[PDB]
Every structure is written in structure tokens, then in C-alpha cells.
Structure 1
Amino acid sequence: HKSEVAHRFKDLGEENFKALVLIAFAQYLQQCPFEDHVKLVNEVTEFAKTCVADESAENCDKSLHTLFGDKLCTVATLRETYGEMADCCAKQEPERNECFLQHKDDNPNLPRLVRPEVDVMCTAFHDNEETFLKKYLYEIARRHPYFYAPELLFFAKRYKAAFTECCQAADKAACLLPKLDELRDEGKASSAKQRLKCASLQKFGERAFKAWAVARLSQRFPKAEFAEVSKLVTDLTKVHTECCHGDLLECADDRADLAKYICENQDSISSKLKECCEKPLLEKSHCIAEVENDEMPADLPSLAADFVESKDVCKNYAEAKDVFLGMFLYEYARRHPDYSVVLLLRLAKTYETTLEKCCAAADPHECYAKVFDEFKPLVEEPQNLIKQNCELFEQLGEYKFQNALLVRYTKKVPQVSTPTLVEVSRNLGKVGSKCCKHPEAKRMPCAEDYLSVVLNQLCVLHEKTPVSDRVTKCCTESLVNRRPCFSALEVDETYVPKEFNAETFTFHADICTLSEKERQIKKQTALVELVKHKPKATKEQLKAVMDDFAAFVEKCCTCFAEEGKKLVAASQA
């Protein structure tokens, strides 16, 4: 490749090239207007087509990083605005792109994005669709500088699906808003999940990540041998390790190389990956991560023969403990795709803790003969918590389930802030609406995904503003010990009730004119403060206050002053 800029333009295409270039300059120059970035993109695009025409043209032989860094310091307002980022342009090309990665703010102090009216968006979508969709990538990339740009390019594609469909129906806000809200959350979930796995490499190390990958790749590729999975884990570990460093180009080629090997060794990996290897190079690595799990081999034997009914186990473990433990994990995961990844890790650790003291004393086979019995309480514990909560969700509704959870978690950790308790209990109830309609097969895997996002978001606000001692210990623990720790929280018997402030429970007629969503947040906020003022209230007592307040908000619709003041004194019992 004499000219790498020409090769990208040929493989990606003009459309995706310009988009990825916009996303690239938005991640670095986050505080730059949309009109300045469009000027850079078209200056890069017009230069790249000269390389496509004449591959031996001036500066076309330069690498992508060299040309990128050069154009990045072409901006005249680089020193005044971004400061130390400009003092690094006096460095050489290999060291220059490293500093540019170390001067990327993950949380830039930018104003919150406000969604305009549906008629305003559909009009901007019609008058000039180019500048409207390009603004979508611009705002997100500058606020999510580590977001994998091809995936951000995948979200921007679905962003045009609803605008093409719902801007042409009767009521445009009927389907445009639900599809925009679904995409907004999935995007925020992907960005949060991406930054979660990177912090897992820092503190917990590579061994923990390689264990996660062994389980997940085996559940996804069950008809593959351990040597193939172990190679996929080693390549994928390098991919995530580099993608967390920030170098987008090095992260994009590593995923392209991994997708090459997987599509070349399909008959040794899986059969469900047949369609997505025909998708373009930009979409290969993305779909492979979301590919459906293949059908496991029919007649897999019991895992007791190679791991319980043998005298070489105690020895084969000593030869390579992590290789042996990885073989156990691969065999347990490929046979049980219905388990969560953290559950298989919770099983493999007990099997590890066993053989350490077990096989290194007296009669080894006599000790680990009943090791699979220890797997019973750990496997059924999240299976019963699923049947408990999903049954409560079915008998109640999403609203009532959240309110049911809003009181259980307030009583367990009352020291947490009220808006944190509200948003937490709401997102937890949305997990039920998403995957309690799934069968037992895909229930626990899905719950693991949404819970890890919600539970980490709960601690992102608690890390910046602590409050609870128990909540700190549950989120500073391991990834496999974070969910069982939170499930091990009970009512805070060592809590002093909050003083009664009738101004809090004082409502106004604005709630009757308020939105159905905002009326939920306000009605749930008073439910928390009520449980904080008197946490020893029974379930039947709270149901009376709640059913009376439902009629109070309906009977009064400035009536909330008179008859509303009767509830505050009536409920004081």
C-alpha cells in the first residue's frame, strides 16, 4: 500500500470515509463547531481522491497517523482552545499520536443534548438530510471520544431508518420517539459497556478478561475445539487491550484481522457466521460480536469423566493450572449457553479453590468427588431470583414493579440520594420488561448484560459522591462478586429515620398537567422520602397511603392544599 489514504477510500467508500473522518476529528477537537469540522472533512476527502487518482502524488505516501496529526495542527485555534494538545505537535509522528490519545477528555463539560420537536426534526431531515445526519455523529463523538467509530456509524444508519419511516406517517411522534429512545439507550449502553471492560483490564488484569472471553466465545462457538477458542481468546484479548488505548486505526485493523481469521476458519468456528462474512469490511467485526449462538454438539458427555473421574486431573492441573481451568470453563460454557458468563466464572473459581487444597493433600479423588454438588447452590441462586422477580413483574406491571423495587432498595440502602434511588429502581424494572418475556434460555444471559450496565452506572454517581458504606463494598469487589453482594443487602436496622418535612410531600396541581413520565418521577420521589421518614411501615400500611394518594390526585383534579393536608396527618399512623 503505497498510499494508505487511497486504500481506505477504496475499501470504505466515499460516504463512510467522510463519516469516519468527521468522527475522528470530533473525538479529538471536541470543542470545535460543526462548521469547522465539515471544513476539515471535505479538505481530507478532496486530498484523498487525488491519491485515489495518482497513488504516487505528493504526501499520499505518508501514513494515516502522519497526515491526521498534520491536519490536526493545521487548526489555528489549537493552542488557545486545547492547550497542551498543541504543545505536543512539536513531537515526532510516533510520539505525537500517543500524546493526542492522552489529551482526550472522556467527560467534556458540554451542554446536555435536547431533543427538538418531532416536526422540527422531520423538517430538518427533509430540507438538508446531509447536515442533519452528520450532526448526529458530530455531537455523539465529541461527547464519547472512545466510542468505536464504525459502531457509531452503525447507529447513525438506524438513525435514518425511523426518520425515513416515521416522518411519513399520520402521527409522526407515534413511532419516531419510541425508536429514537430505544436507539438513545442502546447507544448509551454500548458506550458504558465499552468503558467498563477497559477498566476491567486495569485493576483486575488480563487473566480475568481471558476467562470471560473463554466462556463467552465457547457459548457463542460451541462446535469448536479448545485450541481454536484459546486462539480466539488470545487475539480478542489483544484487540480489547489496544482498543482501550484509544488508537482508533490500530483498533480498527486488529478487528479487521480477527474477522479475517474467523471468516477463513468458519468450519472450525461456527455455522451461524455464514451471512455476516459477506457483509462489507466495516460491518464484519461488528456483527460477529452480535452473532447468534450456534447449536451445541449433540452428544457432549458429562464433565465428570475428565474432571472428577480421573487420577491425572490432580496432575494435569499442576502442569498448567490456567490451561486446565480454561478447559473446564470451555466445556462447562459450551454445554450451558443459558448461564451467565459471571456464573460460569463463579463455578470455575470454586473448582479452582477446590483442587488447590483438595488435590494437594491425602486422598485427592476422595475429596473432589463431590465438587459438582457445590455447583448446585450457585447455579440455582440466580435461577430462583429470576423466577421470583419475573413472576412479580407479570402479576404487577412495569410501573408497579419499579415501585415495588423502589421501596425494597430504599429500605436496604436509605443513605443513597433520592434521585439516585429513583433512577436505579426504574432502570432495574425496565430489565424485567425486556427479558422476562424471554424463555429461561436467554433470560440469565440478558439479565447479566443489563444489570452490569445499571449497577455500574449506580456506582459512577456513588464514586463521585459517596454516601453508603455497604454500597461501596459491593462495587469495589470482583465482577463475579458485585451482583451477589447487592443481592445480599437487607434492611438497614442501623439507620436513623429522616425528619418529617411536609414541604416535600406537599404537592401542587401541576402534577395533573404534568406528563405521564414526569408524574411517575414525582410520585416515586415521594415514595422514597416516605420510606426514609418511617422505614418500619408495613406493606399493608404503605398500600393504604398509596391507594389514598391515587384518589387524592384524582379527586383534586388548587384542591391539593385543603384535602391534601388531610392525608399528611392521616398517613402519620
Structure 2
Amino acid sequence: SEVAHRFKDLGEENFKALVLIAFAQYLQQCPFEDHVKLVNEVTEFAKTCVADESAENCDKSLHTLFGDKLCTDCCAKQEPERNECFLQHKDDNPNLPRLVRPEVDVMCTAFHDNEETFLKKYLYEIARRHPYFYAPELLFFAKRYKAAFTECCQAADKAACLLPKLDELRDEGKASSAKQRLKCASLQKFGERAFKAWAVARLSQRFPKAEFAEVSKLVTDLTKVHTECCHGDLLECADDRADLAKYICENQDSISSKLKECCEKPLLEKSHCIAEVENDEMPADLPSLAADFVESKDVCKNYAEAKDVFLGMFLYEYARRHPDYSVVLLLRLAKTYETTLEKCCAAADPHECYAKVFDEFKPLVEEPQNLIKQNCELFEQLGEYKFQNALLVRYTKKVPQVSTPTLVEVSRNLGKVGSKCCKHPEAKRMPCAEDYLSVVLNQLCVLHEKTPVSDRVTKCCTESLVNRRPCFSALEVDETYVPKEFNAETFTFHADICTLSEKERQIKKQTALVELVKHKPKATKEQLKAVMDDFAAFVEKCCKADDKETCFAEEGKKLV
């Protein structure tokens, strides 16, 4: 019996949780206490099965069991095609109430009142709004969300304690979800082989002192974890994730010397810890690569005789000595090498055709290097908010078809890179910057995917996950684009704008900026600053009273 096996390793409180999440992800439109009920039957059923293995129906796969409960289009359909239906029905941008957080006291009132139903409503709300969210990490966000309600409601002021701590959570939230979203699309749209290469590369940076047979082992385990998570098999996902942790913590003199403190922590924490560890110090006296990947006579023998292992060794030896290269770059480097080997071994003097191989990395390394210096400067010379507006006009010009909210959301998150990365010392700038940019570009990739409107985006999104960034960078303004038709149903206003949070306040402006730029695809910096400055002036007026509602209306209409 599978269920039971999972109920035992995971324990109940986790089990109950992981099943809840899976139901929220499977059915994002369905009511809360409909799902809690479904979770309850299953848990109680899994107890009968935990008792007697033979108990009727306990031999059934998790898919059959979860699918049946769910069904109490996709249901008039049987396993395995049925499960594929739920998975294929997942929605990255679901029509659901923004999640406004009401008066704190009331949150402490519901928390101390009913504390199981209050953590279960948090899982349920994150999960249906983030249908690909790394299941085990959620549990960890839930532990912390409690620790915060527990340790603020019993304090002087509960607004000053809680809110910051809870804001720090929502942030880590977003970022973790976007990171997991990108692993799932690597597997789903591009297949295991690409993910494994990504893994080989990243782990090898983290664990440079570790050997290739050790990195491979961790790579199969890691990909197995994610395969299941991204496929919605959360229970096995959590189980196998815990096991990787038990494993890393036992062999940590074979893997890295940075695990001490992570591996003394409780299960939920250690995994989260391990996944964030600092790169270990790269080994002492390391032979340049050329040795066996260029100088050798068996070069072409080995690539023919064992390509995957061989190209595995390369990426690994190259990665372990470039913690200052982004994973994307190294993956490009790796592809450029296999491709070269491809032509050279086919020709009359292979050793000669391929000895210039390392000399085709030059331009590939250069491109990201400059781009990261240029805008890391523009941003010290501009600041985040002003940096975001610049990205916002650039990317709108590139792909003006994409929806405003997507444009605003992506571009702002693109701005968060200067802030996040440009502080770092140059040998950390690049993996930060570029590895961060892939996550936010994938967001755009998956947000646009629900309803494609721009073939320039569709193309860069399907061509190669690795090339995705350069593909976006190299785009220039869209001169085919039919300039947009000015609409009064826009710069219509809303005396609310006077009382918006600083965030919401910047978000309305940026949203107006997009519109603007979409109205004149070709327009100066100097004419946008002009038209924007007008709008700002108009708003500062009407936010000073008598009749704000009519002020906004007259000037709305007196711009009509």
C-alpha cells in the first residue's frame, strides 16, 4: 500500500498538509472547506490502510485515490489520462481576489481561536494561487507563519511585530515560487536531459571539492525530487526530498564543508538550508581543462564512446572552477563544445579543428559580462524605481503586444536585480544577475503562454531555455507594431490614488507609462518625461481638495 507508506515516513501533520496543497493546486477555483473535507476522508482512509495493508482499496495508486476524491470534463475520464487532465488544467494566473490582509486584531482573533483552520487556510490560499509551488518549501513557510502569529499576538503591539515578519514571508514567497516555476518548465517543456545538465552545473559550483560520481548521484536524486513535485506527486516529492537530506548530512565530508550548521537543524529547515548553502571553497591545485578536453588524443574516441558521461565530465570540471559564471553561461559553453566536437570529429584533422575550441568561449563570456556591467551602473546611476521605469519602456518597446499587468509585473521584477545583485563583488554579480533574470523571463514566458499575443515572445520562450535571456536582450523595438488607439477608459481616475500605498502608487504610474509608450511606440525619453510629468502634476493638484472627484474628472475629460 502506497498511501500508508507515505503516511508513515511523512507523519500525519505533514501528510495532511501536503494533501491539502495538492488539492488546492489540482482545483484552484474550488471553495476552502470543500477541500478540507476531501483531505479528511483521505487521511482517515489512510489510517485504515496504515492499520491493515490488505484493507479494501489500499493497493490503489495515489493518482486513483486523489482523483476519485477530487471528482466528488476531467472526471469523465480515467487514469492515467485523468491525472494528466488535472495537471494540464493548472493556471499560473487564476481569476482570484487579491488577498487583502484585514485588521490585525481580527487575525489574532481567528489565530488563537482556531489555529489548525488558520494554518490550513494559509496553505490553501498560497497553493491555489501558486499551483507549482515547491510543496516541501511551503510546509516551511507554514512553520514560520505560525511562529510569527504565535509570537506577536502575545506582544505589546501586534501590528508592529507581525506585519514586517509577514511581509518578509510574502517576499520570500514570490521568489521561491518563481524559482520552482522555472524548474517545472525546464522539465515539462524541455525534458530530463536539460534539467540534469542544469543540475550538474549548479551542484558542481556548490560542491567543487566533490567528485563526479558524487555529483551524478545527487543529480539523479535532485531531478527525481523535482520530477515528482512538478508532476504533482507531492508525497513522494517530500519523502524523497527528506531522504536526499538524510543522505547529504551523512556524507558531508564527501560533498562539502559548509553543511555543518544546516545538518544540525530540524527536517523542514535543513532542506531549505541545504538548497541555499554558500559555494564551498574550490579545490587547491586544479589542472586546467585543456589537459583531457583539448590536448588529448582520445578526445573524439571518448565523445563517441561515452558522450553523455564525457559531456557530463566537462560541464562538471568547467563549473567547479567557475563559481563566477552563471549556470546559463556554462550551459551555453557546454553546448558550444559538444557542437564543436560534432563537426571536428567528422573531419580529416580533428585534433586541429577542435584545439581552437576554448577560443569560441570568449564572445559568449563577454556578452553577459558587459550587459551586467552596463545596467548595474545605470542602476547605481538611477535607483530601483527609476531603474524599473527604464526596463519598462525598453521591454514594452521590444514586445508591445504583451498585456500591461504582465509587462509591469515582469519589468518591476527585472528591476529587483540591480538591487539584489549589483551590490555583490563582480565574481558574484553574474550568477546572481543572470540566474535571477531567467526566473523573471520564465515568468513572462509562462504568463504570456496562457494567451499568446506576441510571436517575438513565443519564439524566445520555445527556442532554448539557456538562450532565453540573449534572445530577449537582442530584441529591439517592434517596428511592425500598429501604434495603439488612445482610450478614455484608462487615464480615467480614482480619487483613491491619493491614498494608495507607495507601492500601489508606483504601480499605477508604471501602468500609465506602459499605456503611454504603447500609444507612441516611437517616442523620445524627453517626450515621455514630459507627458509623465504632466500626469504627475495633474495628480498632485486633484489630490488637493474641495472636489477631488470632479478635479480628476474635469482633467480626465479635459484631456478627452
Place the TM-score, normalised by the shorter chain, in its bin: 0.7 to 0.9
Going from structure 1 to structure 2, the CA distance change for 1:424 and 1:19 (only over 3 Å counts) comes to closer
Give a deviation string over 1:130-178, Cα, whole Å, max 9, x none: 3322221233345555544432210111212443455566765456444
Q: Distance in 2 between matches of 1:520 and 1:477?
A: 34
C-alpha displacement of 1:477? 1.1
Name the counterpart of 2:60.
Answer: 62
The alignment partner of 1:560 has SS state of: helix
C-alpha displacement of 1:272? 1.6
Going from structure 1 to structure 2, the CA distance change for 1:450 and 1:132 (only over 3 Å counts) comes to same
Q: Is the 8 A contact 1:101 1:247 kept in 2?
A: no
Going from structure 1 to structure 2, the CA distance change for 1:533 and 1:295 (only over 3 Å counts) comes to same
Q: Distance in 2 between matches of 1:93 and 1:467?
A: 34
**TM-score normalized with structure 2 length:** 0.83
Where structure 1 has 5 or more consecutive residues not aligned to the other structure, the ranges are 74-85, 569-573
C-alpha displacement of 1:251? 2.6
Going from structure 1 to structure 2, the CA distance change for 1:322 and 1:149 (only over 3 Å counts) comes to closer
Give a deviation string over 1:354-389, Cα, whole Å, max 9, x none: 122124323333333332222122112112222222
Going from structure 1 to structure 2, the CA distance change for 1:175 and 1:415 (only over 3 Å counts) comes to farther
Name the counterpart of 1:20.
Answer: 18
Name the counterpart of 1:565.
Answer: 557
Going from structure 1 to structure 2, the CA distance change for 1:207 and 1:389 (only over 3 Å counts) comes to same
Q: Which has the higher contact order (CA 8 A, sep 6+)?
A: 2
Q: Is the 8 A contact 1:343 1:378 kept in 2?
A: yes
Q: Distance in 2 between matches of 1:174 and 1:340?
A: 39
Q: Is the 8 A contact 2:328 2:435 kept in 1?
A: no
C-alpha displacement of 1:11? 5.9
**TM-score normalized with structure 1 length:** 0.81
Q: Distance in 2 between matches of 1:233 and 1:388?
A: 35
206-215 or 23-32, which deviates more: 23-32
Q: Distance in 2 between matches of 1:209 and 1:354?
A: 22
C-alpha displacement of 1:319? 2.0
Give a deviation string over 1:180-202, Cα, whole Å, max 9, x none: 34423433443444343233334
524-533 or 548-557, which deviates more: 548-557
State the percentage of identical aligned residues: 100
Going from structure 1 to structure 2, the CA distance change for 1:235 and 1:555 (only over 3 Å counts) comes to closer
The alignment partner of 2:296 has SS state of: coil
Q: Is the 8 A contact 1:209 1:237 kept in 2?
A: yes
Going from structure 1 to structure 2, the CA distance change for 1:169 and 1:542 (only over 3 Å counts) comes to farther
The alignment partner of 2:80 has SS state of: helix
15-24 or 305-314, which deviates more: 15-24
Going from structure 1 to structure 2, the CA distance change for 1:214 and 1:531 (only over 3 Å counts) comes to same
Name the counterpart of 2:143.
Answer: 157
Give a deviation string over 1:216-239, Cα, whole Å, max 9, x none: 110111111112212222333333
Going from structure 1 to structure 2, the CA distance change for 1:63 and 1:546 (only over 3 Å counts) comes to closer
88-97 or 449-458, which deviates more: 88-97
Q: Distance in 2 between matches of 1:88 and 1:523?
A: 42
CA RMSD of aligned residues (A): 4.1
Q: Is the 8 A contact 2:15 2:235 kept in 1?
A: no
Going from structure 1 to structure 2, the CA distance change for 1:310 and 1:465 (only over 3 Å counts) comes to same
Q: Is the 8 A contact 2:4 2:47 kept in 1?
A: yes
Name the counterpart of 1:39.
Answer: 37
Q: Is the 8 A contact 2:6 2:239 kept in 1?
A: no
Which of 523, 528, 532 is residue 537 of structure 1 equivalent to?
Answer: 523
Going from structure 1 to structure 2, the CA distance change for 1:88 and 1:533 (only over 3 Å counts) comes to closer
Q: Is the 8 A contact 1:226 1:327 kept in 2?
A: yes
514-523 or 28-37, which deviates more: 28-37
Which of 147, 162, 165 is residue 179 of structure 1 equivalent to?
Answer: 165
Q: Distance in 2 between matches of 1:451 and 1:498?
A: 29
Going from structure 1 to structure 2, the CA distance change for 1:467 and 1:327 (only over 3 Å counts) comes to same
Going from structure 1 to structure 2, the CA distance change for 1:174 and 1:428 (only over 3 Å counts) comes to farther
Q: Is the 8 A contact 2:93 2:447 kept in 1?
A: no
C-alpha displacement of 1:344? 0.3
C-alpha displacement of 1:122? 3.0
Bigger radius of gyration among the two: 1
Q: Distance in 2 between matches of 1:246 and 1:186?
A: 22
98-107 or 462-471, which deviates more: 98-107
Q: Distance in 2 between matches of 1:263 and 1:278?
A: 9
Going from structure 1 to structure 2, the CA distance change for 1:141 and 1:469 (only over 3 Å counts) comes to closer
Number of positions where the alignment pairs a residue of Structure 1 with one of Structure 2: 554
Going from structure 1 to structure 2, the CA distance change for 1:444 and 1:117 (only over 3 Å counts) comes to farther
Where structure 2 has 5 or more consecutive residues not aligned to the other structure, the ranges are 544-549
Going from structure 1 to structure 2, the CA distance change for 1:220 and 1:88 (only over 3 Å counts) comes to same
Going from structure 1 to structure 2, the CA distance change for 1:210 and 1:167 (only over 3 Å counts) comes to same
Q: Is the 8 A contact 1:552 1:564 kept in 2?
A: no
Q: Distance in 1 between matches of 2:363 and 2:408?
A: 32
Q: Is the 8 A contact 1:410 1:531 kept in 2?
A: yes
375-384 or 512-521, which deviates more: 512-521
Going from structure 1 to structure 2, the CA distance change for 1:552 and 1:308 (only over 3 Å counts) comes to same
Give a deviation string over 1:421-447, Cα, whole Å, max 9, x none: 222222211232222223323332233
C-alpha displacement of 1:524? 1.9
Give a deviation string over 1:430-475, Cα, whole Å, max 9, x none: 2322222233233322334432332122233322332223222111
Q: Is the 8 A contact 2:258 2:278 kept in 1?
A: yes
Which of 211, 217, 220 is residue 234 of structure 1 equivalent to?
Answer: 220
Q: Is the 8 A contact 1:276 1:284 kept in 2?
A: yes
Going from structure 1 to structure 2, the CA distance change for 1:394 and 1:227 (only over 3 Å counts) comes to same
C-alpha displacement of 1:348? 0.9
C-alpha displacement of 1:340? 1.4
Q: Distance in 2 between matches of 1:308 and 1:513?
A: 65
Q: Which residues of 2 match residues 291-440 of structure 1 at below 5 A?
A: 291-440=277-426
Going from structure 1 to structure 2, the CA distance change for 1:555 and 1:25 (only over 3 Å counts) comes to closer
Going from structure 1 to structure 2, the CA distance change for 1:172 and 1:550 (only over 3 Å counts) comes to farther
Q: Is the 8 A contact 1:276 1:287 kept in 2?
A: yes
Going from structure 1 to structure 2, the CA distance change for 1:352 and 1:175 (only over 3 Å counts) comes to farther
C-alpha displacement of 1:407? 1.7
